[PDB]
Ligand binder design. Structure first.
Ligand SMILES: CCC[C@@H]1C[C@H](N(C)C(C)C)CC[C@@H]1N1CC[C@H](Nc2ncnc3ccc(C(F)(F)F)cc23)C1=O
Ligand SMILES: CCCCCCCC/C=C\CCCCCCCC(=O)OC[C@H](O)CO
Ligand SMILES: CC(=O)C1=C(O)C(=O)N(c2ccc(Cl)cc2F)[C@@H]1C1CCCCC1
Ligand SMILES: [Zn+2]
Length: 445
């Protein structure tokens, strides 16, 4: 096999090195000089880029050894084995973190939004690098520089039991764990909604989204998704009430996530009020999560006193007569005064679906990117994980032969070579799938 390796590995690894280095370097430059590392997700992508770099800087040494032999010493051997493993495990770990993060985001997990901070990022990133190191320790310890058949090699020399342990450990952290994580996420996504629409999207369309302190048509002061600040002229009074509700010096400006944080506080407060009203409680209890949202929508607009005015319609809703309740609501004063908003609320109540509203785009496009990242990772590293599992545990089960181990080694070499060419793929996936990344490239050039 060595003959083929000397002709193929040096140009292959060199080409991978060139594309991967400038690729992940561009990713880092963007995250620092365009995104400025302000978001939690910017931290993970930064560490993911670092993982690939830590990996591919080792390529020139592996390619040189294939052409000649290992000449850098034992200490250098254990060092680059460390970068090789740490870069690898760090890679898949930070892909999983991003996978979870963007999953929780499209389901609008409240605690995840409250956790979406650079502080939470730095901490969990430090722990992630630790686990990556501890998973690299066995590889480092039993890897040495030794003269085999009058040729120097930087290779692994595990005892019988330790090679078995290392194999199953690698398969868990690099296959079983990510696979399970992804299944959880796919399930949680498909169970939330088929249209991926939450109450957040609904009231964002109907009530709007204020990033700057907005003066109501009457004279009231609002912010975010329909949040009353005060009812009196002074904008200083408005800023005063807002700066208290956030805990920050806002100067009358809010951020998108701060809006949803406020929004969540207003939703459960509305639900709290509904479940405390004698006429709204039995209706609310007989409704599913979709039609309940439409009721919260009406409370968001007219208040519980106003919603309680629809005595007829409420009873019909309470009795699951959607069609008839829909028609009756189209005759109300509320309907004729604000027809377009009412119409799509009436539809929600009638059909019990989000068909009256447009689905989220960027939220879906986000999980499209990160799931693709992980699927492609699987493509590149799964054939290696399996063939070494066969070459370890299940070679005792069956598959036994004299030329077996030799051929299983060949397959191990080839598949690992395949996996080693993955450290240059992520930035390419960004450019092909991710629209924000291409936008960052447009302003870079
Ligand atoms: C040549 C140095 C091998 C080196 C070992 C190192 N190792 C896990 C620890 C020391 C970190 C990881 C990185 C390197 N590896 C691990 C295997 C991978 N493929 C190969 N290795 C060595 N001869 C090969 C010859 C032909 C072929 C082909 F399939 F193309 F024909 C592939 C080869 C590689 O390269
Ligand atoms: C060598 C041959 C193999 C090469 C080919 C393998 C490449 C597969 C990569 C990604 C799969 C698509 C990932 C899709 C990510 C999930 C998309 C999603 O969930 O959003 C859809 C949305 O629900 C719609 O309404
Ligand atoms: C929808 C979205 O948030 C993104 C893109 O449409 C895109 O190209 N992004 C993007 C941003 C920076 C970098 Cl370096 C690479 C990216 F792909 C962001 C990613 C945010 C992390 C999860 C995956 C999507
Ligand atoms: Zn959403």
């Amino acid at each position: 096999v060595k003959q083929i390796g000397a002709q193929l590995l040096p140009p292959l690894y060199s080409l991978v090195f060139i594309f991967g280095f400038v690729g992940n370097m561009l990713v880092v430059l963007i995250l620092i000089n365009c995104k400025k590392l302000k978001c939690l997700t910017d931290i993970y992508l930064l560490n993911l880029a670092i993982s690939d770099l830590l990996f591919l800087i080792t390529l020139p040494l592996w390619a040189h050894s294939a052409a000649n032999e290992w000449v850098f010493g034992n200490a250098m051997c254990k060092l680059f084995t460390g970068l090789y493993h740490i870069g690898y495990f760090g890679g898949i770990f930070f892909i999983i973190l991003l996978t979870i993060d963007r999953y929780l985001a499209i389901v609008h997990a409240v605690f995840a939004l409250k956790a979406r901070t650079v502080t939470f990022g730095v901490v969990t990133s430090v722990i992630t690098w630790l686990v990556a190191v501890f998973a690299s320790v066995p590889g480092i310890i039993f890897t040495k520089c030794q003269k085999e058949d009058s040729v120097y090699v930087c290779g692994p020399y595990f005892p019988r039991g330790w090679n078995n342990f290392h194999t199953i450990m690698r398969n868990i952290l690099g296959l079983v764990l990510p696979l399970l994580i992804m299944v959880i996420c796919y399930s949680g996504i498909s169970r939330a909604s088929k249209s991926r629409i939450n109450i957040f999207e609904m009231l964002r369309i109907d009530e709007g989204l204020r990033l700057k302190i907005y003066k109501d048509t009457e004279g009231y002061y609002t912010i975010g998704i329909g949040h009353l600040l005060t009812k009196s002229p002074s904008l200083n009074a408005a800023k005063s009430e807002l700066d208290k509700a956030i805990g920050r010096n806002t100067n009358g400006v809010i951020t998108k996530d701060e809006a949803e944080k406020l929004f969540n506080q207003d939703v459960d407060a509305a639900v709290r009020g509904i479940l405390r009203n004698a006429k709204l409680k039995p209706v609310y209890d007989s409704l599913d999560a979709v039609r309940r949202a439409a009721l919260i929508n009406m409370v968001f607009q007219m208040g519980e006193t106003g919603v309680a005015g629809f005595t007829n319609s409420l009873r019909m809703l309470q009795q699951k007569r959607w069609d008839e309740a829909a028609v009756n609501l189209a005759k109300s004063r509320w309907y004729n005064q604000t027809p377009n908003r009412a119409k799509r609320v009436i539809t929600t109540f009638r059909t019990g679906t989000w068909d009256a509203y447009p689905p989220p785009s960027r939220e879906k496009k986000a999980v499209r990117v990160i799931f693709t990242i992980m699927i492609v990772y699987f493509l590149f590293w799964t054939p290696y994980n399996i063939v070494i599992l066969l070459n370890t545990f299940q070679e005792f089960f069956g598959l036994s032969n004299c030329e077996s181990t030799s051929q299983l080694d060949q397959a191990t070499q080839v598949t690992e070579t395949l996996g080693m060419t993955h450290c240059c793929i992520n930035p390419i996936i960004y450019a092909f799938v991710g629209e924000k990344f291409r936008r960052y490239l447009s302003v870079f050039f």
